[PDB]
Amino acid sequence: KRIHIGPGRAFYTT
Numbered sequence: 658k659r660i661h662i663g664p665g666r667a668f669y670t671t
Contacts, residue, residue: 661668 658671659668660670
């Protein structure tokens with residue numbers, strides 16, 4: 658899995 662949340666960067670991927 659890989660979850661990433663930056664300045665409005667919805668990079669949520671399970």
